[PDB]
Symmetry: C3
Subunit: 189 residues, 3 copies
């Protein structure tokens, strides 16, 4: 099966991927961003250095890089988790991390949303910082990602699975276990 | 005028249809699932003889049955209200209760949403379970209705159709006052 | 750049449009309803004479009007701000203000949603209902309308890969027109990036 895992940044969406890769073999977890970056570095070596450098690219060249990366990912032949973002905040607004080409090429069985509590995201981004959105911004962002998922579902006829993590953690990294277990229950169902 | 009446199941969405049919001769109320049935058992009487059996069809046959149902419906000259679901909860998440085709074939003027209060929904589902006619919580129902709103808005943006939301969240003086309100609102919509 | 500015009616959407068109250069602000009305008036002068005569037409003729408006609108400049409505409440339920064509013809960089607090909107509408410019919506009606505008914008973004910027003007003002100055600064900051 093919599922696209999404969530707001700085919340634990990478943690679930690490723990899914660990706890389940026969499962290929892939970061769409890393594949796009590698394809870009290969196609534009003399100018692409770090991840941010992908903003230098023209619109159409970047779209082609996305298409190529989706082509690469479509080759994975067993259980697949595609790690990416539905929306990314820009000074110009929320921008889709996906494109219809990705949905058509990868042919994902479904999308998964990881919804958290704003307070959690705040503390989490603080931890990642030591090594500026408000709770309102984060609620807005999550509702926006939800609308994006419902739109992509209405266009491509795919599932949208919302995993709730608003509840308080008795111990740190409880959200991770819950999400990983739900996703594995979903894969073996 | 043709509309797609929808809402979470177990809340009164069929009562509205039946009452509407009682209360308006200039109208035809049809349930998409029931037409899917009639047209499937017309072709596969061997393995399809009860509703819950439709799971057995491959996606090819079942999609063709959906297309044939929407086509048979589209032959209704008079006002039309198509009862169906926007999204169905599954172990894989929500899935659209409509395929783009349906919408194209029917050419619905709009989509009507019936938004209930979650407790009503659960209470109704319990009472309907005890009558031999059948676990979600209030949060799950709120989420389902919100996702239904989002599906209606997406379909409108894609196909250019109205999105009429009917509020049945208020407390009822007497049982089945929600159906009275919804029926009257829809008729008002038609006779304008 | 090209942006489509929207928000519930009677809340301060043309205010921001005017403050923009004046406080910026190379910036052309244009209202979609006005171009629609002008083109319809030209094509059907016999019956188009008030902004409500426009919907005495079949939706196909009106759709052609909308496509012409868009075409006509894009031609105006290489920079733009299109004042329009994401959705409009009607006896049959919220109807889209744009069409998949509008955005293919104008190729807008993004959509902007000015999201207000409904209480402010009620007050503004009834202050407009005293100055001659203006209808009985409530707080919940308006919250639903704004949520529906949000959903429409996100849908169109998913469809055409455009930004959806949301400007929060729900907070209470320290003085009149603080919301408008805030929004104008946000949009300018965005453009001068
Ligand atoms: C699940 C969880 C994460 N965290 C911390 C660990 C992480 O360092 C931080 C952010 O989670 P990340 O694992 O970094 O999630 P991400 O997808 O946003 O990362 P990336 O920038 O690469 O896209 O949150 C907690 O403090 N408590 C928790 O319960
Ligand atoms: C409208 C209404 C229904 N009820 C009861 C009648 C039924 O037992 C149940 C309503 O369920 P139904 O009216 O039968 O609707 P449904 O769940 O079958 O819809 P769908 O097509 O999606 O499957 O609740 C009330 O008690 N009060 C009410 O106001
Ligand atoms: C921003 C703002 C507007 N107002 C008033 C001024 C106007 O009467 C009204 C602002 O709304 P409009 O500027 O008229 O915005 P609009 O184009 O969306 O409305 P319409 O469809 O009617 O053309 O509210 C205030 O009183 N304080 C404020 O801070």
């Amino acid at each position: 099966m093919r599922f696209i895992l999404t969530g707001v940044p700085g919340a634990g969406k990478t943690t679930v991927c690490n723990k899914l890769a660990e706890k389940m073999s026969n499962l290929s977890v892939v970061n769409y961003g890393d594949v796009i970056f590698e394809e870009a570095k290969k196609l534009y070596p003399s100018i692409i250095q770090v991840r941010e450098d992908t903003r230098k690219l023209p619109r159409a060249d970047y779209r082609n890089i996305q298409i190529e990366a989706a082509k690469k990912i479509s080759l994975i032949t067993d259980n697949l988790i595609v790690d990416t973002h539905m929306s990314l905040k820009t000074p110009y607004g929320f921008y889709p991390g996906l494109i219809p080409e990705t949905i058509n090429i990868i042919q994902p069985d479904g999308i998964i949303l990881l919804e958290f509590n704003p307070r959690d995201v705040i503390a989490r981004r603080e931890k990642d910082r030591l090594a500026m959105e408000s709770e309102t911004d984060i609620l807005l962002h999550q509702q926006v990602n939800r609308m994006f998922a419902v739109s992509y579902s209405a266009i491509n006829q795919c599932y949208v699975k919302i995993i709730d993590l608003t509840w308080p953690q008795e111990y740190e990294f409880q959200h991770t276990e819950y999400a990983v277990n739900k996703i594995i229950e979903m894969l073996n169902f």
